Ligand binder design. Structure first.
Ligand code: FAD
Ligand code: FAD
Ligand code: BHA
Ligand code: BHA
Lengths: 391, 391
C-alpha cells in the first residue's frame, strides 16, 4: 500500500491530524498497535484550551462537544485555610476553558474517521520506520503474521512517549531535557455529582488534591501520592477519607462520595526533545514531550503541534512549498517551553515536596499569596491557564 | 543615664528611627560600636523605593537627596543576546525608584542628628541588654573603660546581622529560615561616567553582571563570583575585562573604565527570624532579616520596619496605646516575606548556578522570556521592583 502521510498511533494526536488532513484532501493512513477498545479505555485529560476547541470545530468534529462540554470561566486555588477564585474570563481578556473528557474527544474523532472511510489499521504490530532521509520513506508492520509495507512521503509520529518514532531518530541528533518528580497522582473516576461547578486545586500539608468533573453526574478527583504506592493499597474508602482530609472543611462536607469506575496512578515528569523531527519524520504530542498534569497542558500541546503540522503540510502539498516543514520544530518548541515553564510552576507551588527546609516552605506559601493577591499575578495564571496564543 | 527608646546601632535603620522619633518629641539615645568614619566607609546600597524616599522627606532629611538623587523610570534586563527594558513608571501605575548612595543617606542622617543635639555614643563597647521583659529594661556598655548603664522603656535593635540584639532573645523563642547562595558579588566603585542612564542587570553564561551608578561621574559595577575568590585576586584590569565579557557587545564598547575607589565581595544569603521582638526589644533592619542584593530590598526593608516601629511607638507614647506594639512583627513579616520571595526570584533567574542540568537551564531562560514578554509578567516585576505598598 501507499499513502501520502503515514500516521503512527491512533491517540488524540494521530486522529486529529488524520481528520484535518483528510478533510483537506491529503490522504493519510493511521497505524495503531492496540485495539480501539483499549484506546477508549484511557481516562487521562479533561480540560481543553480554547484554541483546541476551535481546532475540533475546524476538524468538523464538534457537535457533541458543543452540547456536552462545559465552559468554565473560573478555577479555584485553596491554600492554608483560604479558597481563592481566579476569574479566567476577565483576567484573560474574555477567554475560557472547556471541560470535556479526553476519552470523549477520542470517541468523537474515531466516529468521524470510521464514517469518512479513511484508512485505519488497528493491531498493527512491529511497526518499523525506514528511509527517514530519502525522498520515499516507508513503514513496515505485521497484521496477523504478514509483513506489509506502506510507502508514503511523510510520517507523523503520534505514537506517544513509548512510541517507536522517537527511537527511530539517531540518538546523536536529539538533545533531551528531563525532570522526574518524586511523586505521582492517584486519580479516581466516579459517577457522582461534582463538589463544585468549577475546579478546585488544593495545596495541603498532606499533599495536593484536585476536584474535577466530566459532567453534572460524573466527577474526577486526584490526590498526590509517593511513587512507592500501589493502587491496590488504596481502596475507595481510603481515597475518599484522604481526599476529604486535604480539602476545605466546607467543601469536604458537601462531597458526595461513591464507588469508583476507574482508579490509577500516573507519575509526574517533564520531558522535551530537541529537535522534533528527522528527515521526513515529524514528532507530535507525547512522542516529543511530556508535562506534569498540573496545568492541564498535555492534550493541549498535542493539539497545538498537530495544528502547526497540518498547516505546514497543506502549504507543502497544495501550495507546493515543502521548505516550510523545516521550521516545524522552531514553531512548536516556543510554545512547548512556555507550557513546560507554567506546568513546572503550577507543580512546584501546589505539591508538597519531600525534604524541604523551612525557607522553601515559606517561599511556596508566599508564591501563592503573591500571585493570588496581585492583579498582575492573577493575570499570569489566567493567560497561561486558558492558553497562550497559537503562533 | 536614662532615655525613652534606646537604639543599638548607628547604621541607616538606627539613625532613621532616631530622627523620626526625635522629631516627634520621643527622646532616644543611639549606641554605636564603631566610629562615624568606619560607618561612612561602607558603600553597600544605591537604590531606594519611593516609600523610603517619602520617609526621608518626613524625617526632614531630603534637601540633598532631592537635589542629587536620580529618578529612574525604567531598568534593563539583558539575556541571550537581547536587552529588554522594563518601563517601571507605566507598568507600576506611575511609580519610580531613586538612585542615591546608602553612604549619602547615612551622611545626611548623621548631619541631621548632630545638629539636633540628640544623644549619640560612638565607640560604645560591650553592649549588653538587660531585663527585656520587665517594665524597666536597661542597656550597659563601656566608654573608654567605664561601665555605664542606660535606663529606657524600649530598645530598638538596629545593630545589623552580627549585632547583639538578636543574640539577646532566647534561642527557643525564635524560629529561623535561612538560605545561603553558592556565590557572592564582587562590587567595584569607580569615578567614571556610567554606561547607561538606567541600570542593566545581565544574565550571562559566565555569571551575572550589574551596571549601576551613584552619579553622572560615578559608577558602581558588580560581577558574580564563587565564594572561594579573594578580592586581592581581582585586579582592576581583570574586573573590567570580566565585566566586558558578560555584557552586550554594544554596551561593552561604550564602557569607560578606570581605577577603583572601592572593591569588595559580598556573599549572598536569605534570612528571616520569627518573631522580630521580645518583651521590650524590637528588631529592625538586618538584625532581623537578610536578602540577596539582587532586587535591592535590604536598605528598603530596613526603612519599612523602622516606619512601622516609629508609628506604633507614637501611638504608645502620645496616644497612650502601648498594646499596638504587640502587632509589630505581624505587620512587618508580611512585607518581609513578599520582599524575600521577589529577591529570591530575581536571584534565581539572573545568576548562573553551579550543577544545573539542561532542563533547569531552559526553565531559567524561559522564565526570563515569559516575564519580559508578557504584559502581565512585566507588571509583576515593576510593582515589586518599585516596591509594594506600605500597610
Ligand atoms: C499514563 C498517562 C496518563 C496521563 N494522564 C493525564 C492526566 O491525568 N491528565 C492530563 O491532563 N493529561 C494526562 N496525560 C497526557 C495526555 O493524555 C496526553 O498528553 C495525550 O494522550 C497525548 O496524546 P498523544 O496522541 O500524543 O499520545 P497518546 O494518547 O499516548 O496516544 C499514542 C498512541 O500511540 C499508539 N502507539 C504507541 N506506540 C506505538 C507503536 N510503536 N506502534 C503503533 N502505535 C503505537 C498507542 O497505542 C496510543 O494509541 C496522560 C498521559 C499518559 C501517557
Ligand atoms: C556586607 C554587606 C553588604 C551589603 N551590600 C549590599 C549591596 O551590595 N547592595 C544592597 O542593596 N544592599 C546591601 N546590603 C544591605 C544593606 O546595606 C543593609 O540592608 C542595610 O545596611 C541595613 O541597615 P541596618 O541599619 O539594619 O544595618 P547596618 O548598615 O549593618 O547597621 C548596623 C550598625 O550596627 C552597629 N553595631 C553592630 N553590632 C553592634 C553592637 N553589638 N553594638 C553596637 N552597635 C553595633 C554596626 O557597627 C552598624 O553601624 C549589604 C549589607 C551588608 C551587611
Ligand atoms: N490539571 C488538571 C485539571 C483537570 C484534570 C481532569 O482530569 O479533569 C486533570 O487531569 C488535570
Ligand atoms: N540590585 C541592585 C541594584 C543596584 C545596586 C547598587 O549598588 O547600585 C545594588 O547593590 C544592587
Amino acid at each position: 500500500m501507499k499513502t501520502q502521510v503515514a500516521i503512527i498511533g491512533a491517540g488524540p494526536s494521530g486522529l486529529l491530524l488524520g481528520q484535518l488532513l483528510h478533510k483537506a484532501g491529503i490522504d493519510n493512513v493511521i497505524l495503531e498497535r492496540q485495539t480501539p477498545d483499549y484506546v477508549l479505555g484511557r481516562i487521562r485529560a479533561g480540560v481543553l484550551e480554547q484554541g483546541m476547541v476551535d481546532l475540533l470545530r475546524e476538524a468538523g468534529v464538534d457537535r457533541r462537544m458543543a452540547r456536552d462540554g462545559l465552559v468554565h470561566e473560573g478555577v479555584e486555588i485553596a491554600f492554608a485555610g483560604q479558597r481563592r477564585r481566579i476569574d479566567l474570563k476577565r483576567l484573560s481578556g474574555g477567554k475560557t476553558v472547556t471541560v470535556y473528557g479526553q476519552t470523549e474527544v477520542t470517541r468523537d474523532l474515531m466516529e468521524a474517521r470510521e464514517a469518512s472511510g479513511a484508512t485505519t489499521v488497528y493491531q498493527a504490530a512491529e511497526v518499523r520506520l525506514h528511509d527517514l532521509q530519502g525522498e520515499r520513506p516507508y513503514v513496515t508492520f505485521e497484521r496477523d503474521g504478514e509483513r506489509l509495507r506502506l510507502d508514503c512521503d511523510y510520517i507523523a509520529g503520534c505514537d506517544g512517549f513509548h512510541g517507536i518514532s522517537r527511537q527511530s531518530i539517531p540518538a546523536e541528533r536529539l538533545k533531551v531535557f528531563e525532570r522526574v518528580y518524586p511523586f505521582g497522582w492517584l486519580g479516581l473516576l466516579a459517577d457522582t455529582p461534582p463538589v463544585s461547578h468549577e475546579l478546585i486545586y488544593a495545596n495541603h500539608p498532606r499533599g495536593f488534591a484536585l476536584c474535577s468533573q466530566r459532567s453534572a453526574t460524573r466527577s474526577r478527583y486526584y490526590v498526590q501520592v509517593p511513587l512507592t504506592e500501589k493502587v491496590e493499597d488504596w481502596s475507595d474508602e481510603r481515597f475518599w477519607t484522604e481526599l476529604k482530609a486535604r480539602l476545605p472543611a466546607e467543601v469536604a462536607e458537601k462531597l458526595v462520595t461513591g464507588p469508583s469506575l476507574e482508579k490509577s496512578i500516573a507519575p509526574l515528569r517533564s520531558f522535551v526533545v530537541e529537535p522534533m523531527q528527522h528527515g521526513r519524520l515529524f514528532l507530535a504530542g507525547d512522542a516529543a514531550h511530556i508535562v506534569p498534569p498540573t496545568g492541564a497542558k498535555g492534550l493541549n500541546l498535542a493539539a497545538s503541534d498537530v495544528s502547526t503540522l497540518y498547516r505546514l503540510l497543506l502549504k507543502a502539498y497544495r501550495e507546493g512549498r515543502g521548505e516550510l516543514l523545516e521550521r516545524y520544530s522552531a514553531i512548536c518548541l516556543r510554545r512547548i517551553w512556555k507550557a513546560e515553564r507554567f506546568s513546572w510552576w503550577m507543580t512546584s507551588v501546589l505539591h508538597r515536596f519531600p525534604d524541604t527546609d523551612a525557607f522553601s516552605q515559606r517561599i511556596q506559601q508566599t508564591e501563592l499569596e503573591y500571585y493570588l493577591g496581585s492583579e498582575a499575578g492573577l493575570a499570569t495564571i489566567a493567560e497561561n491557564y486558558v492558553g497562550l496564543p497559537y503562533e
